[PDB]
Amino acid sequence: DMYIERAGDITWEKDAEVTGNSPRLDVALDESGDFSLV
Amino acid sequence: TTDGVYRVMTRRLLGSTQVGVGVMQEGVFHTMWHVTKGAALRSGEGRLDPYWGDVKQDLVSYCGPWKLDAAWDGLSEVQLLAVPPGERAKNIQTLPGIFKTKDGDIGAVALDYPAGTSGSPILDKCGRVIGLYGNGVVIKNGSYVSAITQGKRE
Ligand SMILES: N#CCC1=N[C@H]2CCCC[C@H]2N1
């Protein structure tokens, strides 16, 4: 039995930690909702 | 049922385990299908029943139709409002990459978090939810990249 609990407001935070790269990838999406690399 | 970000928990396994995250907006709860598998949810003493879902999109809404319609502009940095298991909600700013598919391009965020972080919202600079994090792929270098998954508002 699953339940939900509030974790916060949805807001943009000024000066949040900035990380991650921006990869451009060729992908395929199957009928089961799984993404894969082409 | 106040608007905001929520953890999705279960007591079926050892202790209390966070299986995902979701967004309450306009009285509707939004998460990824793989988090709940379409099961009903509890909110305090009340029950939330599924209303719409699609395995291929990997999305599900409760109490009403999908309400989130904002889209990534294809240029600006966004924020993942990550809600990791047993940890406080935290904003992470990033410039999305792209998933190129035979049916069009989708934004993608290259950030890695525990599986139970699935359903955390990705936001634009106006605080609008442009999609949910948690359905993606493992690339060559072993890095995880999530699609920015957004539903359709009928
Ligand atoms: N939500 C989320 C992110 C995530 N989900 C797992 C899927 C397989 C790769 C390792 C994990 N990273």
Residue numbers of B annotated as active site: 34, 58, 118
Nearest to B129 among A10, A31, A35 (CB): A10
Q: Total structural domains in chain B?
A: 2
Kindly state whether residue B73 falls inside one of the protein's structural domains: no
Separation of alpha carbons B115 and B128, rounded Å? 23
**Same domain for B89 and B48:** no
Residue with CA nearest ligand 1 atom 11: B115
Alpha helices in B93-146 (DSSP H): none
Which neighbouring-strand residues pair with A17? B92
Do B80 and A4 touch, CB atoms closer than 8 A? no
Q: Ligand 1 centre from B113 Cα, in Å?
A: 6
Residue B93 C-alpha, separation from nearest chain A C-alpha, in angstroms? 5
Closest of B55, B62, B54 to residue B8, by C-alpha? B62
Residues 1-30 (A) with a CB less than 8 A from some CB of B: 1-13, 16-29
**Same domain for B142 and B83:** yes
Task: Provide the experimental method for this PDB entry.
Answer: X-ray
**Same domain for B14 and B54:** yes
- The verdict on the CB of residue B134 being under 6 Å from ligand 1 is yes
Q: Return left, alpha or beta for B141; rule: phi > 0 is left, psi -120 to 50 is alpha, else beta.
A: alpha
Residue among B62, B145, B146, B148 with most chain A CBs within 10 A, to mutate = B145
Which neighbouring-strand residues pair with B105? B100
**Same domain for B102 and B47:** no
Alpha helices in A1-38 (DSSP H): none
- The verdict on the CB of residue B118 being under 6 Å from ligand 1 is yes
User: Where chain B is broken, by preceding residue (C–N > 2.5 Å)?
Assistant: none
- The verdict on the CB of residue B137 being under 6 Å from ligand 1 is no
Residue numbers of the domain that contains B54: 4-62
Separation of alpha carbons B107 and A16, rounded Å? 20
**Does the distance separating the beta carbons of B56 and A4 come in below 8 Å?**
no
The resolution, in angstroms to one decimal, equals 1.4
Give the E-state strand segments of B11-143 in sequence order. 17-25, 28-31, 41-43, 46-48, 50-54, 59-62, 78-82, 90-94, 97-101, 104-109, 121-123, 129-132, 136-138
Separation of alpha carbons B112 and B146, rounded Å? 8
**Same domain for B96 and B125:** yes
**Does the distance separating the beta carbons of B91 and A16 come in below 8 Å?**
yes
Kindly state whether residue B153 falls inside one of the protein's structural domains: no
- Per DSSP, the three-state class of B116 is helix
**Same domain for B41 and B13:** yes
Buried b / exposed e over B110-123, threshold 16 CB at 10 Å, is: bbebeebbbbbbbb
Do B107 and B131 touch, CB atoms closer than 8 A? yes
> Domain of B38: which CATH number?
2.40.10.120
